[PDB]
Design an enzyme around this catalytic site. Structure first.
Site, PDB file in Angstrom:
ATOM      1  N   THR A 113       7.030   3.597   6.531  1.00 45.86           N
ATOM      2  CA  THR A 113       7.238   4.338   5.294  1.00 45.86           C
ATOM      3  C   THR A 113       5.938   4.583   4.523  1.00 45.86           C
ATOM      4  O   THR A 113       4.873   4.120   4.914  1.00 45.86           O
ATOM      5  CB  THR A 113       8.247   3.621   4.346  1.00 45.86           C
ATOM      6  OG1 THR A 113       7.700   2.373   3.899  1.00 45.86           O
ATOM      7  CG2 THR A 113       9.596   3.366   5.054  1.00 45.86           C
TER       8      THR A 113
ATOM      9  N   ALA B  67       2.919  -3.486   2.484  1.00 48.06           N
ATOM     10  CA  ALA B  67       3.359  -3.840   1.143  1.00 48.06           C
ATOM     11  C   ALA B  67       4.633  -4.675   1.244  1.00 48.06           C
ATOM     12  O   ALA B  67       5.672  -4.195   1.711  1.00 48.06           O
ATOM     13  CB  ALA B  67       3.572  -2.605   0.293  1.00 48.06           C
TER      14      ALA B  67
ATOM     15  N   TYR C  38      -1.732  -3.739 -13.309  1.00 48.71           N
ATOM     16  CA  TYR C  38      -2.199  -3.645 -11.926  1.00 48.71           C
ATOM     17  C   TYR C  38      -3.597  -4.217 -11.722  1.00 48.71           C
ATOM     18  O   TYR C  38      -3.745  -5.378 -11.354  1.00 48.71           O
ATOM     19  CB  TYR C  38      -2.129  -2.211 -11.385  1.00 48.71           C
ATOM     20  CG  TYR C  38      -2.163  -2.175  -9.877  1.00 48.71           C
ATOM     21  CD1 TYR C  38      -3.361  -2.282  -9.191  1.00 48.71           C
ATOM     22  CD2 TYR C  38      -0.992  -2.076  -9.139  1.00 48.71           C
ATOM     23  CE1 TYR C  38      -3.397  -2.272  -7.812  1.00 48.71           C
ATOM     24  CE2 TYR C  38      -1.017  -2.056  -7.757  1.00 48.71           C
ATOM     25  CZ  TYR C  38      -2.226  -2.155  -7.101  1.00 48.71           C
ATOM     26  OH  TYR C  38      -2.260  -2.151  -5.727  1.00 48.71           O
TER      27      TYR C  38
ATOM     28  N   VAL D  23       1.541   7.196  -5.929  1.00 43.91           N
ATOM     29  CA  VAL D  23       2.602   8.078  -5.474  1.00 43.91           C
ATOM     30  C   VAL D  23       3.912   7.327  -5.637  1.00 43.91           C
ATOM     31  O   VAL D  23       3.902   6.135  -5.947  1.00 43.91           O
ATOM     32  CB  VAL D  23       2.412   8.417  -3.994  1.00 43.91           C
ATOM     33  CG1 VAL D  23       1.406   9.541  -3.838  1.00 43.91           C
ATOM     34  CG2 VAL D  23       1.955   7.176  -3.245  1.00 43.91           C
TER      35      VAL D  23
ATOM     36  N   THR E 244       6.699   5.354  -3.953  1.00 44.08           N
ATOM     37  CA  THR E 244       7.170   4.656  -2.744  1.00 44.08           C
ATOM     38  C   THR E 244       7.987   3.430  -3.152  1.00 44.08           C
ATOM     39  O   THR E 244       8.020   3.066  -4.328  1.00 44.08           O
ATOM     40  CB  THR E 244       6.020   4.116  -1.829  1.00 44.08           C
ATOM     41  OG1 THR E 244       5.388   2.992  -2.461  1.00 44.08           O
ATOM     42  CG2 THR E 244       4.976   5.199  -1.471  1.00 44.08           C
TER      43      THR E 244
HETATM   44  N1  LIG Z   1       2.355   3.526  -3.553  1.00 41.57           N
HETATM   45  C1  LIG Z   1       1.188   3.804  -4.249  1.00 41.57           C
HETATM   46  O1  LIG Z   1       1.219   4.397  -5.280  1.00 41.57           O
HETATM   47  C2  LIG Z   1      -0.069   3.347  -3.674  1.00 41.57           C
HETATM   48  C3  LIG Z   1       0.045   2.422  -2.523  1.00 41.57           C
HETATM   49  N2  LIG Z   1      -1.082   1.715  -2.020  1.00 41.57           N
HETATM   50  C4  LIG Z   1      -1.189   0.686  -0.996  1.00 41.57           C
HETATM   51  O2  LIG Z   1      -0.829   1.230   0.302  1.00 41.57           O
HETATM   52  C5  LIG Z   1      -0.260   0.179   1.029  1.00 41.57           C
HETATM   53  C6  LIG Z   1       1.151   0.577   1.422  1.00 41.57           C
HETATM   54  O3  LIG Z   1       2.019   0.660   0.348  1.00 41.57           O
HETATM   55  P1  LIG Z   1       3.253   1.699   0.344  1.00 41.57           P
HETATM   56  O4  LIG Z   1       3.042   2.780   1.384  1.00 41.57           O
HETATM   57  O5  LIG Z   1       3.329   2.320  -1.016  1.00 41.57           O
HETATM   58  O6  LIG Z   1       4.497   0.784   0.558  1.00 41.57           O
HETATM   59  P2  LIG Z   1       5.735   0.977   1.469  1.00 41.57           P
HETATM   60  O7  LIG Z   1       6.791   0.044   0.913  1.00 41.57           O
HETATM   61  O8  LIG Z   1       6.176   2.418   1.605  1.00 41.57           O
HETATM   62  O9  LIG Z   1       5.391   0.624   2.975  1.00 41.57           O
HETATM   63  C7  LIG Z   1       5.229  -0.707   3.435  1.00 41.57           C
HETATM   64  C8  LIG Z   1       5.089  -0.791   4.883  1.00 41.57           C
HETATM   65  O10 LIG Z   1       4.732  -2.120   5.384  1.00 41.57           O
HETATM   66  C9  LIG Z   1       5.808  -2.591   6.148  1.00 41.57           C
HETATM   67  N3  LIG Z   1       5.968  -3.993   5.899  1.00 41.57           N
HETATM   68  C10 LIG Z   1       6.183  -4.697   4.792  1.00 41.57           C
HETATM   69  N4  LIG Z   1       6.216  -6.010   5.145  1.00 41.57           N
HETATM   70  C11 LIG Z   1       6.005  -6.112   6.470  1.00 41.57           C
HETATM   71  C12 LIG Z   1       5.934  -7.179   7.350  1.00 41.57           C
HETATM   72  N5  LIG Z   1       6.111  -8.576   6.856  1.00 41.57           N
HETATM   73  N6  LIG Z   1       5.704  -6.953   8.659  1.00 41.57           N
HETATM   74  C13 LIG Z   1       5.547  -5.701   9.123  1.00 41.57           C
HETATM   75  N7  LIG Z   1       5.624  -4.645   8.277  1.00 41.57           N
HETATM   76  C14 LIG Z   1       5.839  -4.820   6.963  1.00 41.57           C
HETATM   77  C15 LIG Z   1       7.005  -1.713   5.800  1.00 41.57           C
HETATM   78  O11 LIG Z   1       7.856  -1.724   6.901  1.00 41.57           O
HETATM   79  C16 LIG Z   1       6.373  -0.426   5.562  1.00 41.57           C
HETATM   80  O12 LIG Z   1       6.052   0.220   6.791  1.00 41.57           O
HETATM   81  C17 LIG Z   1      -0.344  -1.046   0.172  1.00 41.57           C
HETATM   82  O13 LIG Z   1      -1.579  -1.735   0.337  1.00 41.57           O
HETATM   83  C18 LIG Z   1      -0.311  -0.504  -1.157  1.00 41.57           C
HETATM   84  O14 LIG Z   1      -0.811  -1.360  -2.091  1.00 41.57           O
HETATM   85  C19 LIG Z   1      -2.383   1.976  -2.532  1.00 41.57           C
HETATM   86  C20 LIG Z   1      -2.556   3.140  -3.462  1.00 41.57           C
HETATM   87  C21 LIG Z   1      -1.405   3.601  -4.311  1.00 41.57           C
END
Ligand SMILES: NC(=O)C1=CN([C@@H]2O[C@H](COP(=O)(O)OP(=O)(O)OC[C@H]3O[C@@H](n4cnc5c(N)ncnc54)[C@H](O)[C@@H]3O)[C@@H](O)[C@H]2O)C=CC1
Ligand SMILES: NC(=O)C1=CN([C@@H]2O[C@H](COP(=O)(O)OP(=O)(O)OC[C@H]3O[C@@H](n4cnc5c(N)ncnc54)[C@H](O)[C@@H]3O)[C@@H](O)[C@H]2O)C=CC1
Lengths: 415, 415
Positions: B67, B156, B251, B290, B292
């Site tokens: 995701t 995440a 944050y 974004v 999510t």
């Molecule tokens: N959402 C935002 O606004 C922003 C997000 N981020 C960063 O990007 C990264 C991803 O976050 P998102 O895409 O928003 O979150 P998300 O919830 O959409 O995706 C998380 C992903 O990691 C996987 N996941 C979680 N725990 C797991 C585990 N124990 N084992 C295997 N897979 C696991 C999920 O299946 C998913 O694929 C993080 O480091 C987050 O901090 C950084 C900039 C801004």
């Protein structure tokens, strides 16, 4: 198991479901609990609005009380005459993941609304053709009512297990003697199909008479009589349809018609029994063609009704189950001057048999084609009425919302 | 058991279901298989449209690939660079009566679309923090790819089981040192709630750093390195967010921010390891806020994004995951002149940190109330984007239709 598993309640969505119409032919495999309730309240409201009916019965047994005309009787007796009603039907309870039948939800709502107006409502779920169900029905009358003064016989089924023989009879909806070229309506594709219906074997006619003829009606009155739970001067009627010449090859002079004729036969012996018992009576009541689960399954009917709706709506004589049965109670079952016919049947279907309606319908029949269905016919009204049976298309009902299909019924004897 | 029981097929409705949004807070307990597929195709289509990216990697490991940003990387690598992708994630398979998670359906559609363009897609479902999952991932690389030349770290999660100790760390989203008066958005009632968030214990900050800090990223690169499945000159990046002063108390200078700072620490040791291995590199990439599943759960974010969407849409700089990550690949991961910052992080979030956007957002923040939400903010856009995560609100998708939730994935290693 995911990454956020257990840190989050599943909630009620797990036990509830979204229920939408699922139609194949004249079959709909789902029913909406909230919409059945609302459909029933619509009918109750109609009767309440029209107003109380004087000279009505007070303790009523309705055999086939969960849907269509039987339900309409139950509602008319209850909310128009203030009668106590004991309903007999055969329906599937709802459970999680699995919506119950229409009739089940209709009856749950019936018990609910009855209690609100201080009326008596008890129902028995099981095979009305069986001796066991008859006994259970007698016990209920014994314990709660002493006696009933009206017995409405309103069963429509494709089969019957003979309470004595092991034999299982199957109902056949075929023409008699000669094959028929049917010009019908395919309700799914919305085109004109054209069939050829072979006439029934004698063996099938006998089965249809065994199912929808008058033997069981007779068995019921007798069982009631000699348990002493039928009041002196009691009244019993069984519903039937005659129609006019367009329907005759398939219905009146078809195999189902053979059964309905056995009805006119058995009603004599039953009337004799009720006459001897304090001046009681037994009549066959003829009602108009409406949309129900039973009539849908009858060849030619979907298109017939589609047309009939159009013509009668224009004429202003269009009614459904509840209006038919109310007026049957008011005019003929309880009224001073009853609409008796040459055979001594009560009649509520005359507005349908108006020669002006029938001719107008007939000339529209040969002339309907795949392009003009929505202009020559009220196929729309038909569909809506069909969906209504199952609690769909009702106004005020949020069909996107979760609903729990597990709806239980108080004072429901299960056999 | 009813009167027409067994004379009628149940049909597929019995195994399929109608699936609609069911939202409590930043949680949605359902996901639509058809809509996730369509949402993924939307993203793929965007990348395809923008066009191929030159100088991209060819064998890519995405940790957190189902995701949000991780998926967007997987799609950018695959459909923009033609790369083979091995995805690691942790998602619930769908089964009858029980929709799987978003990520599950996203990945099923990913494998489907990848196969259509002749791309390699294999995924591993299970705890990315565990040694076992690391081993399974290494074996897959060994057998199919030999080596990977890019490792995207995009996890995440609210918790982590330490692969060595038994210990289970829980992520805390609190401020640091001092309590905060939060003016937030109640997304269900659609009003302005007002909270007070107590700062985190040291114990909680340590737990948050253990979950979302850089230890696991480090463990991954090391495990990969000494299995020899990382190519010389390989590149690994981990995603982060900085934000501006409005988000800082919660944050950047909050407990989650402590973790993201541990990231900047660990990236040095990891860069050293990749430098030694054929001139490889490790960077922290900063992305914009974004919608999510991860960001939704962050206090203040729903309203922050609601505002941010409004301002940036007007300015014309509004983008979501897929546009962010495409441009991150094009401009900084694969491009000639990379957007490096004072700390040596790559940057794709600059359009958000535009002082003009931030000031305009800030003055709108104190001045939003229960009456003006739909005029001061793009709460609508937010809701839509949130629903989109779970496959809802997608155009071309018939949400009234039955859908089978049991969607399986080819070449899915389950650990
Ligand atoms: N959402 C935002 O606004 C922003 C997000 N981020 C960063 O990007 C990264 C991803 O976050 P998102 O895409 O928003 O979150 P998300 O919830 O959409 O995706 C998380 C992903 O990691 C996987 N996941 C979680 N725990 C797991 C585990 N124990 N084992 C295997 N897979 C696991 C999920 O299946 C998913 O694929 C993080 O480091 C987050 O901090 C950084 C900039 C801004
Ligand atoms: N539908 C129409 O257009 C007209 C209907 N009728 C007649 O009215 C009567 C009722 O038909 P509808 O109301 O249309 O059908 P329906 O299908 O709506 O109702 C049938 C009722 O009998 C019950 N039932 C069926 N088998 C049973 C069993 N083995 N044990 C207990 N209950 C059982 C059902 O639960 C239901 O309450 C029939 O005699 C029918 O021929 C007569 C005039 C026209």
């Amino acid at each position: 198991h995911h990454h956020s598993s257990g840190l989050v309640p599943r909630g009620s969505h797990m036990l509830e479901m979204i229920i939408k119409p699922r139609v194949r032919g004249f079959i709909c495999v789902t029913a909406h609990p909230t919409g059945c309730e609302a459909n029933v309240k619509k009918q109750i409201d109609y009767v309440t609005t029209e107003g109380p009916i004087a000279n009505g019965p007070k303790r009523v047994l309705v055999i086939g009380a969960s849907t269509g005309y039987g339900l309409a009787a139950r509602i008319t007796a209850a909310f128009g005459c203030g009668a106590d009603t004991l309903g007999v039907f055969f329906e599937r309870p709802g459970e999680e993941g699995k919506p119950g039948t229409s009739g089940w939800y209709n009856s749950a709502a019936f018990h609910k609304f009855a209690a609100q107006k201080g009326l008596y409502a008890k129902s028995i779920n099981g095979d009305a053709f069986s001796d066991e169900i008859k006994q259970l029905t007698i016990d209920a009358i014994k314990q709660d009512l002493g006696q009933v003064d009206q017995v409405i016989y309103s069963l429509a089924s494709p089969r019957r297990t003979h309470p004595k023989t092991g034999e299982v009879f199957n109902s056949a909806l075929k023409p008699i003697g000669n094959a028929v070229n049917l010009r019908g309506l395919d309700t799914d594709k919305e085109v004109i199909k054209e069939s050829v219906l072979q006439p029934a074997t004698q063996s099938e006619i006998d089965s249809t008479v065994a199912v929808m003829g008058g033997e069981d009606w007779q068995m019921w009155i007798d069982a009631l009589l000699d348990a002493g739970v039928l009041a002196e001067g009691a009244q019993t009627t069984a519903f039937t349809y005659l129609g006019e010449k367009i329907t005759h090859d398939i219905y009146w002079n078809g195999s189902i018609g053979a059964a309905k004729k056995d009805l006119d036969q058995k009603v004599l012996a039953i009337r004799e029994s009720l006459a001897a018992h304090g001046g009681g009576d037994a009549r066959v009541s003829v009602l108009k063609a409406v949309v129900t689960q039973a009539s849908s399954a009858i060849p030619m009917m979907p298109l017939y009704l589609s047309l009939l709706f159009k013509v009668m709506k224009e004429k202003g004589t269009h009614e459904g189950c509840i209006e038919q049965v109310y007026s049957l109670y008011k005019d003929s079952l309880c009224g001073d001057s009853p609409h008796m016919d040459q055979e001594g049947r009560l009649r509520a279907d005359y507005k349908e048999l108006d020669p002006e309606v029938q001719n107008q319908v007939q000339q529209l029949w040969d002339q309907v084609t795949n392009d003009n269905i929505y202009q020559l016919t009220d196929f729309v009204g038909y569909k809506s009425e069909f969906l209504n049976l199952f609690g769909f298309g009702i106004d005020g009902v949020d069909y996107d919302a979760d609903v729990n299909p597990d709806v239980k019924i108080p004072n429901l004897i299960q056999g």
